[PDB]
Amino acid sequence: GWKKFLWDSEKKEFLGRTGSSWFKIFLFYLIFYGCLAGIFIGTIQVLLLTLSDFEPKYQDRVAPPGLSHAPYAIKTEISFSISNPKSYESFVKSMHKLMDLYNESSQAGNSPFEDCSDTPADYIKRGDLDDSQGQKKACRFSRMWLKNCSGLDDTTYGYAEGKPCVVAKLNRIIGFYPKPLKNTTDLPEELQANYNQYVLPLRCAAKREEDREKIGSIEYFGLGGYAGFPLQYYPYYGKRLQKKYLQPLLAIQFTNLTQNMELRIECKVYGENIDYSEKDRFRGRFEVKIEVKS
């Protein structure tokens, strides 16, 4: 058994068959699998011929945009010691990775960058989603706009003396026009002052009623000095039609933060085509657990 079914010397068989058999089976499987591969490839090519290169056919799983930030928190918590420098390195490294893309050296010349209104403005339509006109042009976004959180002055961005920053960002969606709430009698409390129609407002607060008192002065930095996103940076025409495109950013400094205590801060954007979800905690709003333990 054990030895024979492995190698017999009368019938000159190996594992069961002769030399000419293993070849018949191997050749059959090679031809069979080859045909299988060619068929699968053909059915995938017709699929490539069914889709368009300038627009995703289905855009419903990304209708309400998200709200992400610059620091990379493992559990949406920012905890670091003001003494030990090797504590906030993971934060600054990320922050830097994000801002390193808005360098002026990158944004230069007429192409493909264009100087836009230094003050919030309206939408700008660079035509349809075609290849007729060449690569569209995107508005320039300077670093310096963000005043105390730019890594140009205090590389660390704040984390050095108990005053961290948080660069918020709106998720890029093709053909998405941000729309703000109108001036009518129904509008949140916060939003009444400084109603620049052209600005999408971002406002942070405390999750619990108690924490209000322990959170100090939320100082926002942005285009024009407002706490929002200028409507002029939209819409986004997609990578293929707008490579070298920069999305607006909003900096948030959490000055006067109580020491040695976990603070739950929820930031939220307001607008018509913006809706939140009780399941996705990053759809329109975001949560951060800051704790400057020193």
Binding site: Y58, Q59, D60, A63, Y123, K125, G175, Y177, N273
Partner: protein, 40 residues
Amino acid sequence: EGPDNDERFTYDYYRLRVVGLIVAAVLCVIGIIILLAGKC
């Protein structure tokens, strides 16, 4: 179209679920019919 192109981001999943259920129900019935057709 233009600014108010809100329809480009909506899908009527409700009507789809309703129809898919009607169909599932029908297939289930037909099945039962075939199964008991002969024992009567």
